[PDB]
Design a protein around this nucleic acid. Structure first.
Lengths: 178, 1514
DNA sequence: CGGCCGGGCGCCCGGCATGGCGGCCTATAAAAGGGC
DNA sequence: GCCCTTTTATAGGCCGCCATGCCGGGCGCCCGGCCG
């Protein structure tokens, strides 16, 4: 047991049941932005939940930036209602979470070279593309991450309690390393 | 760029509204001053209407509006001027792009508003027949705008309620246009729009009904039709149509109400029934219907309608209609949730008959639970105010009505208000059965207490707000009835939950606070005193998790003793199964003290007898485990400590609100102060902060001195704990000659070696935030009486400063080990915190401290200057006129002090802090302090230069629009006179209305020629503004006389006013002149004749004698020094502070790496000047070195200059026609020139003087023999230096060069048979070659003579003055690089260059031996060259180098230099991609392309609010 | 002794190939994925 | 289970660059010493 994590990001997706066009969304609204050259899909924002959403030509959606389950659902449903208002037919039916990003700061800096030495059977310490270490912990299945400064980031979970369950079991081992 | 064009640019780029609304005002006023040139302004401001950014487009629209206010209306009866502009905008009104249509509509809005009455008129046709054209034109514009309204499709869904910016703007423009047209056309517009009602441009009806009100009088059919439309709009399917149709009724209800009984009587019914149709989860249209209903229901005739309807039918009665609102009180969308509160609050104030029905217990209960479960700050605040109004009127009937009305809900709501919060993972849910639904008598995680989703700030705010509400009704209940509330709160006051106990203290705090008289609360004195000063319970139910964690760690240790300590069991301590504070736990349960004793004593006991020998390897793990348990145990204890402090504070504040103060008040004061220091939750801390001020007020009013004095001193100490805002004197006492304002760049500010720094950086600002608010509230409470009755707050603020700075700093202040140093860095912080909210009557007291603060600004210790600069920037920004006149007269002149450095650093630090703190309100005074900052931008010390350029980077952008700024309203004469003086002082630098020629005083000889007078005038111009430059004139001109003129004038002016006024900034200091050593006597004789009053001392001399001037050197007025002794004795000449540093030869310092330049750059001087013959010799980086001497911050860092100029120039070696290799250099040349231009002064001797003789040049070509070219080739087939030297050797009796020289000299009198010739070589061997052949075999007749480096300096003068005066010498043999400065070879006729050199300026300097002032015959120079050889490469490179050297300076003069000197002189924590499988790449596609930031929504409301437009439209 | 002679080393000047030093995009190579 | 695309790499050929290389010339400050 120990200090609790916090959640900093949420991601969800919907299969909006229609083959909706994009350039109409780019033209009619000030809110939307769009260009195929630099990115594949329309991007939208909205102010009350303070989230961003991506609308793909196949009708599939992604929502980002929410900080709770029901908040993300409210945002996604709101986006679905916006797209319906622009004249396209739509249905908000299938809702699935695809990511969680927990975050916390450990109370001490870490000599994480030992976390490679004693746990390389799961851990990895390469600085080539990112700072800190990666820990592809298998159960609960999250792509855990730790910085040298003690910042710890918990990624890839699908349900809220999973992050807490992962933190509670990683903390005793990182306690050993200063 | 004109003043107009620089000013109008500010409309597009500017710091804030306050600057741009001044820019537009100045632009319009300046147009009013020059009404004839209107379109010159319009063509410049109009193009911003197509700008891509909303924020500048709207202010450009405002500009084209304001600016046309001045012009007269067109009328031919007493070619419409804007016909081109309107013809353009009326077509941009259909641009496919979005931005341009908004711009066009908003521009047409202003044009039609201001000058619509004259639109489309024609010249020379009578009124009755051009009114036709006017009407037709306005109708056509209306037709276009209606077409846009029907075809608009560019909307905004970015918020809960949509908006259509293009539709709103064109609607406003149509509202503007239709005010001018006649009713005959308005009816057609109305009919067309009503057909458009049937998708719909209904906003036109809103604007039509807004601007015109003759129409509603003209016939009833207008009002009937519009509200028939609105009635069939309110009930529409599309929620968007519902909102816009509902909006139209809101502004026009008053002029709507009297039309007819039935229309209103039906409209109100449809409004009510459309409201009762329950809304969707994502429709905000209901919120605006709430405002419509709150508007209609406020007017009496609507009440009459509802009343008679109620008399007809009970189902329609107001008492039954009102509760239809209730289901919306917790609708998801924030807007409607608040709109319902607003409407119901309005219904509360609607009198007696309309309130008595629905205002009953149910709505009180519903609003109370609503305030508890609210999360948005605005909604909770509105609901609390609503509750206050309801309770107030319901009690204003009588107390017994309220008691009978609300007592039915006392138990559940009293239970709910006192409900605890709990720690995150283990919340206590609220009992959901208490939450009565609105229908009968989604976001429910708030009642779950789900702290993980909702931070404890929100929950603590909720509980204290509930207490703040319930303590109100507890005051209006008659006191015999209180038993149900009283017993509940008094039992909660001893609850095992810390949260419940604190909330009970909060409830009594509110009750005692607002109760009519304090003694009504008297029954609670004992139960609050005992909680304040009894020793506390040791366990708290909400904190159980912490001690559970402690037990877990202790169990880990005890198990570790088995697994790793090998301790046999049966004697270990048992750790209890139950943790203290848990329900039904007995006293035997696990306490924190039990853990603490286990963690050391039993630990040691087992270590006495665990596995022997293995102790040494059990030791590391056991010690780590003990450290872990020590980590958790103290954390739990600190958590208890904070919770206990918070409950103690909540008790103390209520008890002081009850006006009880025990005989010795130490426990109260400790309880409050320790909470101010600690509690982080701002909404809770503010309560203690206010009540401590209440305590001070009460103690001092009661006639008690000691406790008030003590506690005010204590919180004053608390004010200064923030190190980052009040630096520690013990750390900085030794630091001088450094400015702390720049020190943030330095390391160790954030102390990376220990995270303890971050802990303290939090904990210090946490206490400061509290103490500062306590001081401010105390100031607000005491007002004008403060310093009369809180004496210590005067003493700490004044007396240390008085003792410190009344005279010299006493020696005690210089010790970091001594207290008095810290006291006077503290006192200025006390002033800095007090003054911005001190009562205006005490401003004279603060102003009486300005003479001391400004004295402290001129002090040695850097920390003192830093605090003085911050304090002065605070005082002068709060008290503006008096503070700034004191500043302008006292410290502003000191900014130019050259004698010492401490004063100047403070004088610039205060400007930096003043600009930063004052912000964009500085405009009334920027003209005072711009040109001192421009002066300091070139100063010696690097700190001053950096701060000065940082300040000037912002200050320069304000000054284009300050010329014309209105005066401050209250204005001391001493400043206004200063303002006029400064305006005229800088006008000569701002425009070509220049000063007349400098009045060189008569003490200097009055013999100056025209160009020399112009040069002295230019040097005086430089001297005025403390600029520096190069007097890069050719030889022979009176450069020495000019520089001495300006230098002597400066010293004389400095001498006189030092005597006139007692100012240290002007007392005399010596100058120095650096020249090549031979010219020392020239300088001495010239200064001795032309400037007799100046003392001169020559530093050059034998070193044993030179040693004697280590201290005497300051006495003189001018020092003369050789470069080559300055390089040696820089160490002792640099220690002084000089005036007007003059270099007589810039060529010596041209190279950055030469030691002499590294020596010269170290000098500190008040003014700098270089008298070089030619700045450019090889490349522009040589000019960079000179400008690095003159003014380091101007031309930029060395390699940045290299990249920008040196390489692009070098690229043009082999330029082609119209190639980018050529164009890059062509760009670079002029880009450098336009920057360098005002600081050089180039004048050709051949253009200024015709007294000196004319000049002719010719090139002489020769052959390349067989043997020569064979040698060339046989070397060619074989570093570059070896080959280059060998080539230049071998390319020189059968050789062509000697033959060419022979045939040239036999083309002269010397060879055929008076005539004189100079022969120049570059290699001494070649001089020998010509010598040993021309007079030995070829032309023995010639009377030759020789002078080169081999000739000793003691006979060169005799040789040269023999040659130039004795006709017998025919030919002189010489090398170009000999002598240089003053070789007198003026008698020559012809100059023959036998070979050439890479340096062009050296060749010109060699030519100047003959082409000199001391001659009148023509000078004819020949250059011999051999076809095809390497000589041609040398000459071509020389041509390119002289080309750039010429064009980089080209024409220069005092008056031809430009006036725009100011324009050049400035020079996430985790990203895991969410568009695919999780990964940390660090860069992703979608967002990084410039998605940017979402705009604020306020800009819509500040541009579409109808009231502002309707005021703007008369 | 200072004044002047002679020897003395020091300090700046002046060009452009060339080797080291590095990263620019794409080669010949590799893992991971759309498509079959 | 296999082909080609995309991102990614260690290497190729260069774009682009930094700092150096010199010796024949010159002025100058400094020292030891003779001049009167």
């Amino acid at each position: 047991s120990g200090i609790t994590p916090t959640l900093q990001n949420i991601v969800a997706t919907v299969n909006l049941d229609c083959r909706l066009d994009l350039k109409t969304i780019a033209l009619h609204a000030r809110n939307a932005e769009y260009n195929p050259k630099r990115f594949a899909a329309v991007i939208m924002r909205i102010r009350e939940p303070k989230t961003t959403a991506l609308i793909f030509a196949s009708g599939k959606m992604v929502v980002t930036g929410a900080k709770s389950e029901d908040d993300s659902k409210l945002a996604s449903r709101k986006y679905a209602r916006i797209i319906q208002k622009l004249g396209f037919n739509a249905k908000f039916t299938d809702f699935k979470i695809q990511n969680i990003v927990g975050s916390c700061d450990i109370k001490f800096p870490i000599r994480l070279e030992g976390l490679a030495s004693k746990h390389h059977n799961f851990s990895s310490y390469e600085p080539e593309l990112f700072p800190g270490l990666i820990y592809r912990m298998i159960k609960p299945k999250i792509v855990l991450l730790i910085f040298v400064s003690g910042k710890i980031v918990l990624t890839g979970a699908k349900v809220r309690e999973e992050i807490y369950q992962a933190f509670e079991m990683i903390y005793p081992v990182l306690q050993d390393f200063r | 760029a004109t003043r107009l064009d620089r000013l109008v640019t500010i409309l597009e780029t500017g710091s804030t509204r306050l600057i741009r609304d001044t820019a537009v005002n100045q632009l319009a006023d300046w147009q009013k001053q020059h009404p004839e040139e209107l379109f010159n302004l319009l063509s410049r401001v109009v193009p911003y209407l197509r700008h891509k950014d909303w924020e500048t487009r709207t202010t450009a629209a405002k500009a084209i509006g304001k600016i046309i206010e001045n012009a007269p209306l067109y009328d031919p009866n007493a070619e419409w001027p804007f016909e081109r502009l309107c013809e353009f905008l009326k077509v941009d009104l259909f641009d496919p792009q979005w931005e341009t249509r908004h711009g066009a509509a908003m521009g047409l809005r202003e044009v039609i508003r201001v000058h619509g009455a004259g639109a489309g008129r024609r010249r020379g046709k009578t009124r009755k027949e051009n009114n036709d054209l006017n009407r037709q034109w306005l109708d056509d514009l209306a037709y276009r705008l209606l077409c846009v309204l029907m075809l608009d499709k560019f909307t905004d869904y970015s918020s809960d309620t949509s908006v259509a910016p293009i539709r709103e703007t064109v609607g406003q423009t149509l509202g503007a246009v239709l005010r001018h047209i006649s009713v005959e056309s308005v009816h057609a517009i109305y009919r067309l729009l009503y057909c458009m009602v049937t998708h719909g441009g209904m906003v036109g009806l809103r604007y039509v009904v807004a601007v015109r009100k003759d129409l509603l009088l003209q016939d009833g059919d207008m009002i009937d039709g519009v509200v028939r439309c609105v009635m069939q709009g309110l009930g529409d399917i599309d929620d968007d149509v519902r909102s816009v149709s509902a909006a139209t009724l809101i502004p026009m209800a008053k002029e709507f109400v009297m039309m007819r009984r039935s229309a209103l009587d039906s409209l109100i019914n449809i409004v009510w029934e459309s409201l009762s149709n329950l809304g969707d989860d994502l429709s905000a249209s209901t919120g605006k219907i709430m405002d419509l209903l709150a508007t209609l229901c406020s007017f009496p005739e609507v009440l009459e309608a509802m009343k008679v309807s109620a008399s007809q039918d009970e189902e329609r009665s107001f008492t039954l209609l009102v509760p239809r609102l209730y289901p919306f009180l917790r609708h998801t969308i924030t807007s409607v949730r608040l709109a319902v509160l607003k409407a119901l609050m309005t219904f509360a104030n609607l009198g007696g008959e309309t309130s008595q029905g629905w205002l009953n217990g149910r709505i009180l209960r519903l609003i109370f639970q609503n305030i508890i479960v609210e999360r948005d700050q605005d909604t909770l605040n509105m609901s609390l105010e609503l509750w206050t109004t309801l309770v107030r009127r319901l009690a204003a009937r009588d107390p017994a009505i309220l008691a009978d009305e609300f007592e039915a809900h006392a138990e559940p709501m009293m239970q709910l208000a006192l409900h605890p919060i709990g720690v995150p993972r283990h919340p206590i849910p609220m009992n959901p059965a208490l939450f009565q639904k609105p229908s009968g008598g989604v976001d429910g995680h708030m009642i779950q207490g789900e702290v993980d989703l909702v931070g404890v700030d929100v929950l603590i705010r909720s509980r204290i707000s509930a207490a703040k509400a319930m303590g109100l009704i507890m005051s209006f209940i008659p006191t015999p009835r209180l038993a149900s509330y009283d017993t509940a709160v008094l039992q909660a006051l001893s609850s095992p939950y810390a949260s419940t106990q604190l909330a009970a203290a909060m409830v009594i705090d509110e009750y005692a606070k607002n109760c009519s008289t304090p003694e009504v609360a008297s029954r609670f004195i004992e139960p609050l005193q005992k909680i304040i000063d009894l020793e506390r319970p040791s366990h708290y139910r909400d904190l159980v998790t912490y001690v559970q964690r402690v037990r877990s760690a202790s169990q880990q240790l005890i198990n570790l003793f088995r697994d790793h300590g090998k301790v046999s069991q049966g004697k270990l301590p048992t750790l209890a199964v139950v943790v203290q504070g848990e329900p039904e736990a007995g006293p035997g349960a696990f306490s924190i003290a039990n853990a603490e004793k286990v963690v050391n004593e039993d630990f040691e006991r087992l270590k006495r007898l665990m596995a022997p020998g293995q102790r040494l390897i059990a030791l590391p793990q056991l010690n780590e485990a003990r450290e872990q348990t020590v980590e958790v145990i103290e954390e739990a204890k600190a958590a208890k400590e904070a919770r206990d402090a918070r409950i103690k504070a909540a008790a103390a504040c209520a008890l002081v609100a009850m006006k009880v103060l025990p005989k010795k008040p130490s426990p109260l004061i400790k309880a409050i102060m320790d909470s101010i220091k600690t509690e982080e939750n701002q909404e809770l801390q503010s309560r203690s902060a206010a009540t401590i001020a209440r305590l001070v007020q009460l103690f001092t009013e009661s006639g008690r001195r000691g406790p008030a004095e003590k506690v005010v001193a204590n919180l004053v100490k608390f004010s200064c704990v923030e190190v980052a805002e009040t630096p520690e004197f013990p750390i900085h006492a030794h630091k001088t000659n450094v400015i702390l304002s720049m020190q943030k760049e330095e390391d160790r500010v954030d102390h990376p070696d220990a995270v303890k720094y971050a802990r303290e950086a939090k904990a210090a600002r946490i206490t400061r935030r509290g103490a500062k608010e306590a001081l401010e509230i105390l100031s607000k409470n005491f007002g004008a009486e403060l310093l009369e009755r809180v004496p210590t707050l005067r003493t700490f603020m004044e007396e240390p400063l008085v003792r410190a700075f009344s005279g010299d700093l006493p020696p005690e202040a210089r010790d970091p080990e001594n207290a008095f140093g810290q006291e006077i860095v503290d006192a200025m912080s006390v002033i800095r915190t007090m003054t911005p909210t001190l009562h205006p009557a005490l401003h004279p007291f603060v102003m009486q401290q300005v003479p001391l603060v400004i004295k402290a600004l001129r002090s040695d210790l850097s920390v003192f200057r830093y605090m003085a600069a911050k304090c002065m920037a605070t005082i002068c920004s709060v008290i503006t006129v008096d503070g700034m006149t004191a500043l302008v007269e006292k410290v502003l002149p000191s900014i130019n002090n050259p004698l010492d450095l401490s004063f100047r650093q403070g004088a610039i630090e205060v400007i930096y802090h003043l600009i930063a703190v004052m912000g964009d309100a500085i405009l009334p005074y920027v003209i005072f302090l711009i040109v001192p900052v421009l002066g300091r931008m070139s100063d010696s010390d690097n700190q001053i230069r950096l701060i000065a350029t940082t300040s000037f980077a912002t200050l320069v952008k304000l000054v284009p629009l300050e010329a014309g700024i209105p005066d401050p309203p209250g204005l001391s004469e001493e400043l206004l006179k200063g303002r006029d003086r400064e305006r005229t002082f800088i006008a000569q630098l701002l425009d070509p209305k220049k000063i007349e020629p400098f009045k060189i005083p008569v003490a200097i000889k009055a013999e100056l020629r025209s160009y020399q007078q112009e040069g002295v005038n230019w040097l005086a111009f430089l001297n005025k503004y403390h600029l520096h430059g190069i007097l890069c004139d050719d030889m022979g001109l009176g450069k020495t006389l000019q520089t001495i003129c300006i230098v002597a004038s400066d010293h004389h002016q400095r001498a006189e006013e030092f005597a006139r006024t007692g100012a240290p900034e002007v007392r005399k200091l010596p100058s120095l002149i650096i020249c090549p050593p031979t010219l020392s006597g020239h300088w001495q004789q010239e200064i001795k004749t032309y400037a007799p009053f100046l003392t001169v001392t020559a530093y050059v001399g034998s070193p044993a004698e030179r040693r004697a001037m280590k201290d005497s050197l300051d006495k003189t007025d001018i020092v003369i020094t050789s470069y080559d002794v300055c390089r040696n004795d820089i160490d002792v000449i640099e220690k002084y502070n000089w005036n007007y540093c003059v270099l007589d030869e810039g060529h010596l310092i041209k190279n950055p790496k030469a030691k002499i330049t590294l020596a010269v750059k170290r000098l500190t001087s008040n003014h700098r000047l270089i008298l070089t013959g030619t700045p450019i010799q090889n490349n522009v980086l040589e000019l960079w070195s000179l400008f690095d001497f003159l003014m380091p911050g101007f031309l930029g860092a060395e390699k940045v200059f290299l990249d920008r100029f040196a390489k692009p120039i070098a690229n043009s070696r082999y330029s082609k026609a119209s190639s980018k290799e050529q164009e890059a250099g062509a760009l670079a040349i002029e880009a450098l020139h336009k920057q360098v231009l005002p600081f050089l002064l180039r004048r050709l001797k051949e253009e200024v003087l015709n007294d000196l003789p004319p000049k002719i040049l010719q090139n002489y070509y020769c052959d390349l023999s067989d043997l020569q070219r064979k040698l060339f080739e046989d070397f060619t087939k074989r570093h570059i230096f070896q080959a280059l030297q060998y080539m230049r050797k071998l390319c020189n009796i059968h050789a062509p060069k000697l033959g060419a020289l022979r045939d040239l000299l036999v083309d002269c009198g010397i060879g055929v048979e008076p005539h004189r010739a100079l022969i120049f070589c570059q290699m001494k061997e070649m001089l020998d070659m010509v010598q040993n052949t021309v007079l030995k075999q070829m032309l023995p007749s010639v009377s030759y003579l020789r002078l080169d480096g081999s000739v000793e300096a003691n006979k060169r003068q005799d040789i040269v003055n023999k040659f130039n005066s004795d006709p017998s010498y025919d030919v002189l043999l010489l090398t170009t690089s000999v002598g240089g400065l003053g070789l007198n070879l003026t008698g020559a006729d012809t100059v023959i260059f036998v070979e050439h050199d890479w340096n062009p300026q050296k060749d010109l300097q060699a030519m100047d031996r003959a082409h000199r002032i001391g001659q009148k015959k023509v000078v004819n120079v020949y250059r011999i060259i051999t076809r095809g050889t390497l000589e041609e490469k040398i000459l071509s490179l020389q041509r390119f180098k002289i080309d750039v050297a010429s064009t980089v300076v080209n024409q220069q003069n005092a008056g031809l230099a430009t006036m725009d000197t100011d324009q050049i002189l400035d020079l996430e924590d985790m990203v895991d991609i969410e568009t695919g499988d999780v990964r940390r790449p660090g860069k992703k596609a979608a967002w990084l392309e410039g998605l940017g930031e979402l705009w604020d929504n306020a800009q819509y409301e500040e541009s579409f609010d109808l009231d502002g437009f309707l005021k703007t439209m008369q």
